């Protein structure tokens, strides 16, 4: 019964944002699963709406996040996000939000997949938004092959990230890779440093790691480099 004034308002005037907000506020007083079915019906009617998808996923996450970590209801919200990615296209907000929400679930496998699908979906400009979160995500795991491939991509946009990659290789004990990159950097004298380090100091740091570690460093003619 009580749906029918708002249903008539919405079906006669689908572009009336005020009529949508009126019914959403009405459903906020109602029990919230019917609001989710409203959003299901609303997105069937108006999938291109930025406002409908953003509010739905915000409401979905805020309800579910208090539940048990293993609860299937999180996968329902995920299925909404999958559908959200389909309609919304260029709008950055959902791409960021879903990856963050899967980190809250600890779903490492699916978080990477959503990053990898975001990179596949969108231009390099959108990638530049993705990579700060994704590299910060990749560092937090013992997944060095994935982080190596991710770090490499950023370097031709961000030279300062090569310092972060060398520091990542140092902390991952991948000193042989770190020696290869830093020797390339020391030859690439146009390099830019967040510490402002000189090319002599970078070469010094190169020799600091190398002279400590003849065993680990193996791809390089150490004698030639120091001569």
């Amino acid at each position: 019964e009580e749906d029918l004034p708002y249903e008539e308002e919405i079906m006669r005037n689908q572009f009336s944002v005020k009529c949508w907000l009126r019914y959403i506020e009405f459903k906020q007083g109602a029990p919230k699963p019917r609001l989710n079915q409203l959003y299901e019906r609303a997105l069937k009617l108006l999938p291109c709406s930025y406002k409908l998808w953003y509010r739905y996923l915000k409401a979905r996450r805020a309800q579910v996040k208090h539940r048990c970590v293993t609860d299937p209801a999180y996968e329902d919200v995920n299925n909404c996000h999958e559908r959200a990615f389909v309609f919304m296209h260029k709008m950055p907000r959902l791409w960021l939000d879903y990856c963050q929400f899967l980190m809250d679930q600890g779903r490492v496998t699916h978080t990477r997949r959503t990053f990898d699908r975001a990179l596949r979906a969108l231009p390099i400009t959108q990638h530049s938004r993705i990579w700060p979160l994704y590299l910060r995500f990749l560092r937090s795991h013992p997944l060095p092959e994935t982080a190596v491939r991710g770090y490499r991509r950023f370097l031709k946009l961000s030279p300062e990230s090569a310092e972060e990659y060398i520091e990542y290789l140092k902390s991952s004990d991948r000193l042989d890779e770190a020696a290869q990159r830093l020797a390339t950097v020391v030859n690439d004298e146009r390099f830019v440093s967040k510490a402002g380090k000189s090319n002599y100091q970078l070469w010094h740091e190169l020799c600091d790691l190398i002279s400590q570690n003849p065993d680990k460093v193996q791809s390089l003619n150490v004698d030639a480099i120091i001569r």
Partner: peptide, 25 residues
């Protein structure tokens, strides 16, 4: 000093080098 900085750094590093060197040899 620039010169003495390398003196203090390598003095500690040589002892580490001798320790790891005897292990490798």
């Amino acid at each position: 000093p620039d010169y003495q900085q390398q003196c203090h750094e390598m003095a500690e590093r040589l002892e580490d080098s001798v320790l790891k060197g005897m292990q490798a040899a």
